[PDB]
Structures are given as C-alpha cells and as structure tokens.
Design an enzyme around this catalytic site. Structure first.
Site, PDB file in Angstrom:
ATOM      1  N   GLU A  57       0.797  -1.202   0.000  1.00 18.47           N
ATOM      2  CA  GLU A  57       0.000   0.000   0.000  1.00 18.47           C
ATOM      3  C   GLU A  57       0.830   1.252   0.000  1.00 18.47           C
ATOM      4  OE1 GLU A  57      -2.018  -0.725   3.687  1.00 18.47           O
ATOM      5  OE2 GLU A  57      -0.803   0.783   4.760  1.00 18.47           O
TER       6      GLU A  57
ATOM      7  N   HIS B 189       0.184   5.792   0.948  1.00 17.09           N
ATOM      8  CA  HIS B 189      -0.674   6.870   1.459  1.00 17.09           C
ATOM      9  C   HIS B 189       0.140   8.111   1.721  1.00 17.09           C
ATOM     10  CE1 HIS B 189       1.152   5.076   4.950  1.00 17.09           C
ATOM     11  NE2 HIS B 189       0.475   3.970   4.725  1.00 17.09           N
TER      12      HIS B 189
ATOM     13  N   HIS C 145       4.868   0.314   0.175  1.00 15.03           N
ATOM     14  CA  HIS C 145       5.591  -0.459   1.183  1.00 15.03           C
ATOM     15  C   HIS C 145       4.896  -1.740   1.528  1.00 15.03           C
ATOM     16  CE1 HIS C 145       2.898   2.371   3.260  1.00 15.03           C
ATOM     17  NE2 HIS C 145       2.714   1.368   4.102  1.00 15.03           N
TER      18      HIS C 145
ATOM     19  N   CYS D 224       4.885   0.783  15.206  1.00 14.86           N
ATOM     20  CA  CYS D 224       4.531   1.709  14.148  1.00 14.86           C
ATOM     21  C   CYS D 224       3.893   2.943  14.798  1.00 14.86           C
ATOM     22  CB  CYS D 224       3.533   1.047  13.222  1.00 14.86           C
ATOM     23  SG  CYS D 224       3.041   2.092  11.784  1.00 14.86           S
TER      24      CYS D 224
HETATM   25 MN   LIG Z   1       0.905   1.902   5.600  1.00 13.52          MN
END
Ligand SMILES: [Mn+2]
Ligand SMILES: [Mn+2]
Lengths: 145, 145
Positions: free
Chosen positions: A59, A61, A99, A113
């Site tokens: 994905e 973003h 990624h 994260c």
């Molecule tokens: Mn992500």
C-alpha cells in the site's frame, strides 16, 4: 500507568487483534495491538505482528510511518528498495511510497509503528500500479498481493 | 530509509548525544538519541539512555509521555507510584505529573520516549514542590535532585 511485557510482543492489558483473513485478503497472518493512544498525544503507537510466512498489505498513502522492528526478522519493500530488517532497525516510510513487510526469513516479524492520529486511508495498487512495479524484477519477485 | 540497530541502544547513522553534566545538573549520566522527527510526523521519538546509577530529571509538564523500555532495567516514579521497569514495559505519564527514571538496579536503563512535536517546557521542582513531595517517605527516599 505501567503495562509490563509478558512475552515477546505481548503485554499486560493489551489485546491482540488478528486481522480477519479472507480468501481475497491483500495481507497474510497479521495482528495489531494498540500500545498508546490518548487525546493529548498527537500520534498513535501500535505493534503489528506478521506470522512466519506472512505479509502486510502492499500500500501507499500520504501519511508517514515511523517503524522500529521489535521481534524477529524479515524484509521490507519501501519505494524501490528491498531491505533486510531485524530487531531494533528503524524504517521511515515517507509520503506516497509503496511499502510492504514480509516475514520471509524463517521467523515471525513484529514491528512498532507510530503514525499521526489524523491521517488518510491506505491506497491499494491498481492494475497499472502493479505493472509499473513489476518492471523491476526484484520487486516483482518480492511483492505479495 | 533504514537505520539498522548495531548494538543495544545503538543505530547506524544515529548519534549518541550525552546531556552535558554540570555540578548543579538535576540529572546524572543520561544521553538521548533522536530516532524520528519529521515535518510530517506530529510527534518526536527519542531513545534515552541512563548509565548505571544515573537518573533523568525530576520534572512535570502538561505534555504526556509514551515510554517503552528498550534496554536494561530500573525504576520510575510516576506521580505517587514507584515501579520496577524492564525491557519492553510500557509506561504512560499523564499531564502535570511528577516523574523520574532511575538506573538504580545494577544495569543501565534505556527507553524509547514519544512526545508531541509541539509541547510545553518541562517544569522543575521548587523548594515548596520538593517539600510537598518529601511528605511521602517512599518518594523522599527515591527522588534525586
Ligand atoms: Mn501503511
Ligand atoms: Mn518529562
């Protein structure tokens, strides 16, 4: 408050939430844990765990990710680059960069994260995006959908 | 970007920055490393390392701390609670709450610390603050000025 670690990637008062695994799913064998979120903290801090053999969804973003590997080892694609990652490694994922993390080195792979609390939703690759990425043989071999 | 862990509490491309130790310094034998800071990340993520026998400064501020123990073990004071802390433990420090970490258990103590990028400055204790804290015998024994 104190929430003690009870095992690698496990803590008192933190629930493990597996992602629901559907035949169509763009990920494999991933769970999430919420370590910190608070009205006075501008970011949320999570721990993701990818079972051995699994992968996170490919994905991109606008919002950035600050990642530190916490358990095991594996590999990641960030942008054009495939890296080996091990315990402690710092990965920064800048805006609109493809990624994916894989537990492809004989172990599970767990990482911290940190992301802004206010952020855009992930964008999955179109048919075109995948053709673009598969122009690199290394990337074509690595990615999982 | 990747910055690999090279040893406990050390990373390729990350500089260790000791806090310079004055006679009157309210801390002892502490260093900080900047793991993540970016215009697009609402928080800053650091690693603080307290050498064996050292301590961070006793302070409070409106801004909160999200802490994860990374190396060694020690103790912390959060408000009125003194806890044992070890690798992986999660500590949350709420607003305007007195706190201090001590490497008082035979080892160094290293911890990850996430805070808002825009935050208020730490407040150090006045004589009246100290007086007020030292009413509790257990806190009086623990704190280091
Ligand atoms: Mn992500
Ligand atoms: Mn503080």
């Amino acid at each position: 408050s104190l929430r003690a670690q009870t095992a690698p990637g496990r803590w008192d008062g933190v629930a493990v939430m597996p992602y629901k695994q559907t035949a169509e799913a763009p990920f494999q064998d991933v769970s999430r844990q919420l370590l910190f979120a608070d009205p006075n903290l501008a970011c949320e801090w999570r721990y993701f765990e990818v079972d051995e053999g699994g992968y996170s969804t490919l994905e991109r973003h606008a919002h950035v990710h600050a990642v530190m590997i916490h358990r095991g080892h594996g590999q990641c694609l960030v942008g054009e680059t495939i890296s080996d990652v091990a315990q402690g490694d710092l990965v920064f994922i800048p805006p609109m960069t493809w990624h994916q993390f894989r537990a492809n080195r004989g172990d599970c792979l767990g990482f911290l994260c940190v992301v802004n609390a206010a952020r855009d939703r992930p964008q999955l690759p179109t048919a075109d995006d995948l053709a673009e990425l598969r122009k690199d043989e290394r990337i074509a071999d690595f990615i999982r959908t």
